[PDB]
Design an enzyme around this catalytic site. Sequence first.
Site, PDB file in Angstrom:
ATOM      1  N   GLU A 184       0.845  -1.247   0.214  1.00  0.00           N
ATOM      2  CA  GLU A 184       0.025  -0.029   0.025  1.00  0.00           C
ATOM      3  C   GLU A 184       0.920   1.271  -0.040  1.00  0.00           C
ATOM      4  O   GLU A 184       0.323   2.344   0.535  1.00  0.00           O
ATOM      5  CB  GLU A 184      -1.025   0.044   1.319  1.00  0.00           C
ATOM      6  CG  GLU A 184      -2.120   1.068   1.132  1.00  0.00           C
ATOM      7  CD  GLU A 184      -2.753   0.882  -0.505  1.00  0.00           C
ATOM      8  OE1 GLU A 184      -3.202  -0.248  -0.683  1.00  0.00           O
ATOM      9  OE2 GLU A 184      -3.253   1.914  -0.945  1.00  0.00           O
ATOM     10  N   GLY A 241      -9.233  11.585   3.938  1.00  0.00           N
ATOM     11  CA  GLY A 241      -8.209  12.963   3.697  1.00  0.00           C
ATOM     12  C   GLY A 241      -6.901  12.779   4.526  1.00  0.00           C
ATOM     13  O   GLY A 241      -6.049  13.647   4.289  1.00  0.00           O
TER      14      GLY A 241
HETATM   15  C1  LIG Z   1      -6.999   7.702   2.787  1.00  0.00           C
HETATM   16  C2  LIG Z   1      -7.644   8.024   1.420  1.00  0.00           C
HETATM   17  C3  LIG Z   1      -8.732   9.081   1.264  1.00  0.00           C
HETATM   18  O1  LIG Z   1      -9.171   9.875   2.103  1.00  0.00           O
HETATM   19  O2  LIG Z   1      -9.168   9.426  -0.138  1.00  0.00           O
HETATM   20  C4  LIG Z   1      -8.843  10.550  -1.022  1.00  0.00           C
HETATM   21  C5  LIG Z   1      -8.086  11.885  -0.435  1.00  0.00           C
HETATM   22  C6  LIG Z   1      -8.303   6.936   3.747  1.00  0.00           C
HETATM   23  C7  LIG Z   1      -8.361   6.776   5.138  1.00  0.00           C
HETATM   24  C8  LIG Z   1      -9.449   6.293   5.836  1.00  0.00           C
HETATM   25  C9  LIG Z   1     -11.037   6.687   5.634  1.00  0.00           C
HETATM   26  C10 LIG Z   1     -11.784   6.372   6.985  1.00  0.00           C
HETATM   27  N1  LIG Z   1     -10.464   5.900   8.029  1.00  0.00           N
HETATM   28  C11 LIG Z   1      -9.325   6.129   7.318  1.00  0.00           C
HETATM   29  O3  LIG Z   1      -8.139   6.372   7.915  1.00  0.00           O
HETATM   30  N2  LIG Z   1      -7.829   5.438   3.390  1.00  0.00           N
HETATM   31  C12 LIG Z   1      -8.769   4.879   2.689  1.00  0.00           C
HETATM   32  O4  LIG Z   1      -9.829   5.306   2.686  1.00  0.00           O
HETATM   33  C13 LIG Z   1      -8.105   3.438   2.084  1.00  0.00           C
HETATM   34  C14 LIG Z   1      -8.339   3.314   0.752  1.00  0.00           C
HETATM   35  C15 LIG Z   1      -7.583   1.955   0.498  1.00  0.00           C
HETATM   36  C16 LIG Z   1      -6.523   1.513   0.838  1.00  0.00           C
HETATM   37  C17 LIG Z   1      -6.148   0.448   0.475  1.00  0.00           C
HETATM   38  C18 LIG Z   1      -6.810  -0.274  -0.615  1.00  0.00           C
HETATM   39  C19 LIG Z   1      -7.931   0.204  -0.906  1.00  0.00           C
HETATM   40  C20 LIG Z   1      -8.501   1.327  -0.744  1.00  0.00           C
HETATM   41  N3  LIG Z   1      -9.420   2.615   2.616  1.00  0.00           N
HETATM   42  C21 LIG Z   1     -10.045   2.281   3.863  1.00  0.00           C
HETATM   43  O5  LIG Z   1      -9.448   2.797   4.859  1.00  0.00           O
HETATM   44  C22 LIG Z   1     -11.083   1.526   4.121  1.00  0.00           C
HETATM   45  C23 LIG Z   1     -12.349   2.280   4.357  1.00  0.00           C
HETATM   46  O6  LIG Z   1     -13.296   1.356   4.771  1.00  0.00           O
HETATM   47  C24 LIG Z   1     -14.189   2.175   5.892  1.00  0.00           C
HETATM   48  C25 LIG Z   1     -15.000   1.134   6.751  1.00  0.00           C
HETATM   49  C26 LIG Z   1     -13.523   3.086   7.008  1.00  0.00           C
HETATM   50  C27 LIG Z   1     -15.046   3.139   4.980  1.00  0.00           C
HETATM   51  N4  LIG Z   1     -10.796   0.599   5.422  1.00  0.00           N
HETATM   52  C28 LIG Z   1     -10.952  -0.713   5.174  1.00  0.00           C
HETATM   53  O7  LIG Z   1     -11.168  -1.383   4.167  1.00  0.00           O
HETATM   54  O8  LIG Z   1     -10.493  -1.291   6.471  1.00  0.00           O
HETATM   55  C29 LIG Z   1     -10.806  -2.815   6.635  1.00  0.00           C
HETATM   56  C30 LIG Z   1     -10.640  -3.069   8.040  1.00  0.00           C
HETATM   57  C31 LIG Z   1      -9.772  -2.286   8.982  1.00  0.00           C
HETATM   58  C32 LIG Z   1      -9.862  -2.710  10.188  1.00  0.00           C
HETATM   59  C33 LIG Z   1     -10.558  -3.519  10.766  1.00  0.00           C
HETATM   60  C34 LIG Z   1     -11.713  -4.200  10.288  1.00  0.00           C
HETATM   61  C35 LIG Z   1     -11.555  -3.959   8.890  1.00  0.00           C
END
Ligand SMILES: *[C@@H](CC(=O)OCC)[C@H](C[C@@H]1CCNC1=O)NC(=O)[C@H](Cc1ccccc1)NC(=O)[C@H](COC(C)(C)C)NC(=O)OCc1ccccc1
Lengths: 181, 181
Positions: free
Chosen positions: A72, A146
């Site tokens: 990642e 973000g």
């Molecule tokens: C950072 C990127 C962004 O904001 O986009 C454009 C500027 C963002 C930060 C997260 C959002 C909410 N909490 C955060 O810290 N990163 C992402 O959204 C990740 C993107 C991504 C990374 C790697 C592969 C594919 C996509 N995705 C996630 O963090 C993702 C979002 O899921 C929800 C539930 C929060 C919406 N999280 C995820 O898949 O978590 C799996 C998990 C983690 C821990 C315990 C159980 C399951």
Amino acid sequence: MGPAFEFAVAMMKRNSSTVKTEYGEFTMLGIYDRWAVLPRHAKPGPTILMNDQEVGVLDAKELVDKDGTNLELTLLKLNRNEKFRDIRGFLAKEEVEVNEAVLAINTSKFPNMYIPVGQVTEYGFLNLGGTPTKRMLMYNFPTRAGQCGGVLMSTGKVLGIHVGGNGHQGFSAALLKHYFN
Amino acid sequence: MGPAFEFAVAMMKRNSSTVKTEYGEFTMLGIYDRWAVLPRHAKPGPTILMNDQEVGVLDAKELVDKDGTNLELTLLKLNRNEKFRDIRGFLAKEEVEVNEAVLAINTSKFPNMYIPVGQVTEYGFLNLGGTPTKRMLMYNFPTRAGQCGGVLMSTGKVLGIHVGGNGHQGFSAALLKHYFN
Ligand SMILES: *[C@@H](CC(=O)OCC)[C@H](C[C@@H]1CCNC1=O)NC(=O)[C@H](Cc1ccccc1)NC(=O)[C@H](COC(C)(C)C)NC(=O)OCc1ccccc1
Ligand SMILES: *[C@@H](CC(=O)OCC)[C@H](C[C@@H]1CCNC1=O)NC(=O)[C@H](Cc1ccccc1)NC(=O)[C@H](COC(C)(C)C)NC(=O)OCc1ccccc1
């Protein structure tokens, strides 16, 4: 926590920038020479906006391990003459655990903001946004969209880059010395 | 900056909450007893949401000086049994200037985030959103909507509450000892 934040701030001032890709706005740590790092999901194209300025991307490496498993991180070489301050001495050879870390963010949405995330644990494997991912560092604090690219730090150490989160658990991709070269 | 952030974090954990009024989401510092403070423009009605829970507002004081000039603070007495940890010993009798302050924010939008704002200068008079306002403290850092109510702090001191901003200049209303009583 206190010396963590002092280190974090001095490091962000010297080595971070705000970047826009087509996929959003990120914090970006520059590492040495013209090589910087973004979360993989930042998906840098042929040009990015660094501190509001078009910078050509000469090379992007999506990092995977020896079995092709997602780490990642995307290493990028920038088309720019200014060299980053060599910070590879602050990157560990393996994933860092710490009692006190700060997460440092620097974008239009979170301008020079710091979060005390506390203990960082080598979490390792995590299925993240449907992608099996390794070398994850985990910390508890309410994560937000973000904040990716945020730089995870403690006193004297750059641990990794924030890449994901769910609920009140945040995750960094360990930023390891040997990724550089 | 480091001991500022250590103080800031311990203080936010002990005395701050996240509040919603009809006018938005704010950081809120509780001061002593059932009295807390919000920016005036938070415009608390008869009930607020504190940490997601309806709390009746028994009394709100919009603070003005001896000439009726806006101070951009609203004192509120909460309908609640839990008393805040008495922090009036951390409030100065007059407006504090410091070399190193941190601004502490704690809302859904900025969850436990801290900004190193640097030097805080007694700015005093400021026409803010068309309202002539006094006892302003000024600091340089890129301000944002949603950060009002943020608590401005240095080592051993609560300076004031963030109430406004333009560009890269932020402003707190000095939070003064004698406002309490
Ligand atoms: C950072 C990127 C962004 O904001 O986009 C454009 C500027 C963002 C930060 C997260 C959002 C909410 N909490 C955060 O810290 N990163 C992402 O959204 C990740 C993107 C991504 C990374 C790697 C592969 C594919 C996509 N995705 C996630 O963090 C993702 C979002 O899921 C929800 C539930 C929060 C919406 N999280 C995820 O898949 O978590 C799996 C998990 C983690 C821990 C315990 C159980 C399951
Ligand atoms: C906090 C409130 C909020 O976000 O709303 C609901 C949650 C917010 C924070 C500022 C926004 C951008 N920078 C900030 O720090 N506070 C406000 O918006 C203030 C509200 C207000 C206070 C007192 C009386 C009336 C309204 N208003 C401002 O900060 C106001 C916004 O103007 C712009 C230009 C930033 C949009 N600022 C202002 O009037 O500044 C005058 C000024 C200041 C310094 C130099 C020259 C002029």
